[PDB]
Design a protein around this ligand. Structure first.
Ligand code: HEM
Ligand SMILES: N=C(N)c1ccsc1
Length: 289
């Protein structure tokens, strides 16, 4: 199964920077969302979930087709809460109707990471909307009540290795869980992209508790929380080494996250030899906007 990237007709870097800027300005404007976290974290989660359906074995799923717009995927229990991100992006799509859905959802994640002071994430255009019958079935996204062995095996399907997995999970520095969405009780939350997920894992006094949905999660007296799959990164000796590496080197985490996040967003896509180079967008701050 082959998905060839096809640049939206006549568009170039400046077109996509305009879309980036619209997303970033709206991120700034709609600041009250989710107890003043804003929409940055849910947009990152949206980009991960539309990409995280990919299966390396037959190239089904993945960001290319923009299939989250269809009811089957939109209504995946695993995607509960992402409707807020979709609604956020709706007026952006209305202003720029030429951008494909996959391009918009993935660009939403890149914009959010950068505007939350994360690393630059190079981004490529050319995802093409595919028909409703190409929508992957529910159940391809990961469970949170599992251990390190599960996390490792799960991510092999996305062609991600240990370092990639531990880097991607650092996105859990952002936002929070919501009991009504996932059955996990949210803890302290931030909207600034840092390596503090790793510092929290290593430095907090974690207690295994049961929440009001009767699920186990790890909580600290400081008010932070970790999913069982988060905590599994310091239970497994290979993951633990990498957690310590990123806890002690912010730049290395940023660089590794940027590579893994772009790879995640591009899995499944064949780029022509003469496709444009990846774009690196300027932030609003860098533009003086
Ligand atoms: C084993 C892998 C993963 C599991 C089991 C997992 C599970 C979860 C769960 C249960 C939530 C709470 C959703 C809610 O209640 O609203 C969440 C939130 C989040 N996840 Fe993950 N996740 C995983 C990997 C990732 C990856 C790879 C990324 C991106 C690189 C990511 C980004 C996020 C973000 C940014 C949020 C916060 C969303 C918000 O504040 O609304 N996650 N995750
Ligand atoms: N471990 C956390 N505080 C987390 C998990 C999903 S989003 C934030």
């Amino acid at each position: 199964l082959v998905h060839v990237a096809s640049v939206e007709k006549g568009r170039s870097y400046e077109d996509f920077q305009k879309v980036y800027n619209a997303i970033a300005l709206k991120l700034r404007e709609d600041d009250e969302y989710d107890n003043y976290i804003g929409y940055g974290p849910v947009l990152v989660r949206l980009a991960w979930h539309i990409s995280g359906t990919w299966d390396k074995h037959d190239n089904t799923g993945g960001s290319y087709g923009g299939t989250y717009r269809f009811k089957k995927e939109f209504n995946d229990p695993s995607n509960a809460g992402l409707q807020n991100g979709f609604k956020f992006l709706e007026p952006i799509h209305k202003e720029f109707p030429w951008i494909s859905s996959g391009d918009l959802f993935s660009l939403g994640g890149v914009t959010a990471v950068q505007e939350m002071q994360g690393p630059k994430i190079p981004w490529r255009c050319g995802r093409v909307d595919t028909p409703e019958d190409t929508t992957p079935d529910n159940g391809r996204l990961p469970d949170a009540d599992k251990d390190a062995g599960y996390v490792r095996t799960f991510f092999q399907r996305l062609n991600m290795n240990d370092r990639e997995v531990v880097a991607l999970m650092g996105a859990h520095a952002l936002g929070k869980t919501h009991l009504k969405n996932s059955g996990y009780e949210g803890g302290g939350a931030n909207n600034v992209f840092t390596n503090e997920f790793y510092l929290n894992l290593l430095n907090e006094d974690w207690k295994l508790e049961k929440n009001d949905a009767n699920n186990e999660q790890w909580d600290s007296k400081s008010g932070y929380m970790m999913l069982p799959t988060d905590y599994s990164l310091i239970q497994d000796p290979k993951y633990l080494s990498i957690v310590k590496e990123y806890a002690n080197d912010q730049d290395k985490f940023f660089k590794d996250f940027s590579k893994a996040f772009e790879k995640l967003l591009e899995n499944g896509i064949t780029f022509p030899k003469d496709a444009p180079s990846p774009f690196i967008f300027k932030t609003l701050e860098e533009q003086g906007l």
